[PDB]
Design an enzyme around this catalytic site. Sequence first.
Site, PDB file in Angstrom:
ATOM      1  CG  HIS B  41      -0.192   0.103   2.441  1.00 18.98           C
ATOM      2  ND1 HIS B  41      -0.510  -0.424   3.206  1.00 18.98           N
ATOM      3  CD2 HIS B  41      -0.011   1.426   3.206  1.00 18.98           C
ATOM      4  CE1 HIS B  41       0.088  -0.515   4.187  1.00 18.98           C
ATOM      5  NE2 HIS B  41      -0.336   1.043   4.725  1.00 18.98           N
ATOM      6  N   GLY B 143       2.707   5.611   9.505  1.00 19.38           N
ATOM      7  CA  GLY B 143       3.489   5.940   9.387  1.00 19.38           C
ATOM      8  C   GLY B 143       4.232   4.129   9.713  1.00 19.38           C
ATOM      9  CB  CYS B 145       2.800   0.706   7.472  1.00 17.61           C
ATOM     10  SG  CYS B 145       0.500   1.558   7.685  1.00 17.61           S
TER      11      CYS B 145
END
Lengths: 304, 304
Positions: B41, B143, B145
């Site tokens: 993503h 942030g 991830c």
Amino acid sequence: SGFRKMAFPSGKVEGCMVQVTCGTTTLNGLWLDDVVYCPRHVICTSEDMLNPNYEDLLIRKSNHNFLVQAGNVQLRVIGHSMQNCVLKLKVDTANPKTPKYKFVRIQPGQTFSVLACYNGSPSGVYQCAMRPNFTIKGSFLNGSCGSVGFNIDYDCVSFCYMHHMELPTGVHAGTDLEGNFYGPFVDRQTAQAAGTDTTITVNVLAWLYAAVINGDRWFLNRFTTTLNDFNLVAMKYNYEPLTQDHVDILGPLSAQTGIAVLDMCASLKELLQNGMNGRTILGSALLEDEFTPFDVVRQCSGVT
Amino acid sequence: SGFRKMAFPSGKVEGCMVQVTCGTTTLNGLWLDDVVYCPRHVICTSEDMLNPNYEDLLIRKSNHNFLVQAGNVQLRVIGHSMQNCVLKLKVDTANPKTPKYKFVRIQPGQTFSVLACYNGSPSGVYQCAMRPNFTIKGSFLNGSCGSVGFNIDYDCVSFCYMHHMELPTGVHAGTDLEGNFYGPFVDRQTAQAAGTDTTITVNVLAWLYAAVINGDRWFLNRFTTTLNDFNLVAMKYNYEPLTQDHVDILGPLSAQTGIAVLDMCASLKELLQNGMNGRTILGSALLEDEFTPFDVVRQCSGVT
Ligand SMILES: Cc1ccncc1NC(=O)Cc1cccc(C2CC2)c1
Ligand SMILES: Cc1ccncc1NC(=O)Cc1cccc(C2CC2)c1
């Protein structure tokens, strides 16, 4: 989302851990620049521990009696000195992994991470608080002495604790990196009972603010209180008295949530008087006191 | 003495964290050998997130669109591929800090440490468990991830989790290092409710054994039970059914303490039926389920 008992990343500290052996005792040392710091009780035998004369024991030790091993390589000891309850072993090589560092003596209620080690090797990392009775509730076995507590601010490691002993009650005592014990404890196998372990009120309030930020709001009530009224309740429950300094330190959390500090104190007062009624706050069934207001802001903002 | 929610030392993992930016999205990547792993993503804009076609979005991306920075230095991207929900960015330089590693897909109930990161920089480390509903109760902000979960066995890091998302309920979902989500979750901003979060019974028993080893014994009773009788109680309290495999895994703890597994189940049954009565176990007012039997043995023996 979520709130966890988080420790600092331990890498900078792992690079400083060494093994120190003197005679038949092996414990951990902290290697910073060309000095290895370790508990002075490394020079004792279990028989010495009852009433050791460290100055007299140290006379029988020479530089070559201190075996310092960093990973699988031996460091050469060119000097040794005793500073309070720590030994400073001067080695001929500066630790190439030495981070930017400071030695700080923390106040009760302040939190820090511990890198538990055995034989100079890291076993784990966890977050502690210096209790108001100057003990820490750690997780340490024989061989863990010399493991250290620290905080990190961007790239600077502030070393605040070095593990020295377990009291008969299973709680832990140690020193700052100048070798001064926190509290009245002595590095001797003797009757040392800890004083009252009171709850760190300012930390509990910080954690209630963390709970509100993360959605756990059931405990917010329609009440307010005063510092003197709240402290009457805090005394009854062995909570530390809350001062205006504590209220001021909770200011950013009060500003972020829109909940006045004294209103949060009134929520805390009702929680103390009525209990949780089988409910939880941030996955806990008791009031957590090992998060400072700084920790809550740090975790809730993502400081690296 | 003492028992703490302990995470593995994070140093070996800190040396692998990098920042990955694609367009206006920045998250964390894991650099092992000459490959950087990150959530796919990273290629999405917030507008894409509702129903993204990752294959179609990835067509518009070239190697030069993936900006990978390790500390303050830029890595050159020479290849990119999508494997399930992760991107594998081939770089021209092997990570010199690559530890010995494996990718493992954990089972629900297993624990691991998380190194929470932002912009490729570590913020903290904490211990998690993969819940029976395949979520984790972490502490992650926007942030985070690409932050990873792992276990360590002496010098080998077993990577088991990569953070991808927070569900509307504040719980966390992610993948193994092959990009396969744990549970039924998809990397899309859509209605994804988690199933029942049951208690990891074998972990609770392990933690009761840890409590006995550390002196907290008030909950030991004069009773015993059977696996079927205990499971009738476990079902009523949304506890996972206990199997003979679980009893076998608790064998070393039963041997160390001299308390038969079924006797400990009977203590657990009474704790479930009667509650703690305002008492605590290892400083907790609830039954802790994020310590496996392996964790308890590891902590109680001092494995490094
Ligand atoms: C066994 C253990 C468990 C957890 N943490 C530490 C230890 N070790 C000790 O306390 C060793 C010891 C034993 C009697 C006295 C002293 C004083 C000089 C400090 C030191
Ligand atoms: C904000 C935040 C907090 C904690 N942990 C992670 C995040 N970020 C996200 O969840 C970003 C996002 C937003 C909608 C969907 C998705 C799916 C592709 C995974 C991903």
